[PDB]
Design an enzyme around this catalytic site. Structure first.
Site, PDB file in Angstrom:
ATOM      1  CD  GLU A  35      -3.231  -0.544   0.495  1.00  0.00           C
ATOM      2  OE1 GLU A  35      -3.188   0.368  -0.333  1.00  0.00           O
ATOM      3  OE2 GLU A  35      -4.290  -1.091   0.828  1.00  0.00           O
ATOM      4  CG  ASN A  46      -7.826   7.333  -4.597  1.00  0.00           C
ATOM      5  OD1 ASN A  46      -7.312   6.319  -5.086  1.00  0.00           O
ATOM      6  ND2 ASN A  46      -7.863   7.552  -3.285  1.00  0.00           N
ATOM      7  CG  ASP A  48     -12.757   9.071  -5.255  1.00  0.00           C
ATOM      8  OD1 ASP A  48     -11.526   9.236  -5.062  1.00  0.00           O
ATOM      9  OD2 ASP A  48     -13.507   8.617  -4.367  1.00  0.00           O
ATOM     10  CB  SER A  50     -10.884  10.596  -2.303  1.00  0.00           C
ATOM     11  OG  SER A  50     -10.474   9.355  -2.845  1.00  0.00           O
ATOM     12  CG  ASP A  52      -6.024   6.087  -0.994  1.00  0.00           C
ATOM     13  OD1 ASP A  52      -7.102   6.266  -0.435  1.00  0.00           O
ATOM     14  OD2 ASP A  52      -5.975   5.399  -1.999  1.00  0.00           O
ATOM     15  CG  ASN A  59     -10.410   7.034   0.014  1.00  0.00           C
ATOM     16  OD1 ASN A  59     -10.415   8.218  -0.271  1.00  0.00           O
ATOM     17  ND2 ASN A  59     -10.628   6.088  -0.886  1.00  0.00           N
ATOM     18  CG  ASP A 101     -16.382  -0.660   6.857  1.00  0.00           C
ATOM     19  OD1 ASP A 101     -15.265  -0.564   6.296  1.00  0.00           O
ATOM     20  OD2 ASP A 101     -17.442  -0.893   6.237  1.00  0.00           O
TER      21      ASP A 101
HETATM   22 CL   LIG Z   1      -9.528   4.847  -2.647  1.00  0.00          CL
END
Ligand SMILES: [Cl-]
Ligand SMILES: [Cl-]
Ligand SMILES: [Cl-]
Ligand SMILES: [Cl-]
Ligand SMILES: [Cl-]
Ligand code: NA
Length: 129
Positions: A35, A46, A48, A50, A52, A59, A101
């Site tokens: 990661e 990202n 979108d 967003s 990381d 996120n 979650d």
């Molecule tokens: Cl993501």
């Protein structure tokens, strides 16, 4: 900060992650590696809008607030910046909430693509634990 493997194994072990929700330790360290390459400071943008952040590539969409993700829950109640710190407490404390979650570690794409089903134990081999 750019962690040792055995070194990082020991800190996460330390902060409660070994066996956390039955995800043994080598998973956490495997996830970490693909990661972020074990680098507290990884950021990756990202598509979108967003971002990381940190060792676990957490996120900004749901988990942290970074001030530039128009749509954003801040579920871990933290600035994204604190996930980049050299102390992994914030990064560990947020990931317990992710793995809980109701999808477990499949939340970490790399975990799912690179760790899931493998001999994840090999990532703590030889480490004084
Ligand atoms: Cl993501
Ligand atoms: Cl393991
Ligand atoms: Cl990195
Ligand atoms: Cl981090
Ligand atoms: Cl699970
Ligand atoms: Na937010």
């Amino acid at each position: 900060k750019v962690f040792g493997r055995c070194e990082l194994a020991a800190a996460m072990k330390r902060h409660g992650l070994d066996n956390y929700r039955g995800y043994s330790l080598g998973n956490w360290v495997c996830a970490a590696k693909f990661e972020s390459n074990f680098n507290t400071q990884a950021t990756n943008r990202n598509t979108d809008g967003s971002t990381d952040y940190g060792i676990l590539q957490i996120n900004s969409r749901w988990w942290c607030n970074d001030g530039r993700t128009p749509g954003s829950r801040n579920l871990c109640n933290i600035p994204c910046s604190a996930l980049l710190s050299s102390d992994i407490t914030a990064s560990v404390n947020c990931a317990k909430k992710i793995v809980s979650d109701g999808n477990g570690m499949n939340a970490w794409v790399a975990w799912r693509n690179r760790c899931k089903g493998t001999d994840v134990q090999a990532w703590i081999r030889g480490c004084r634990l």
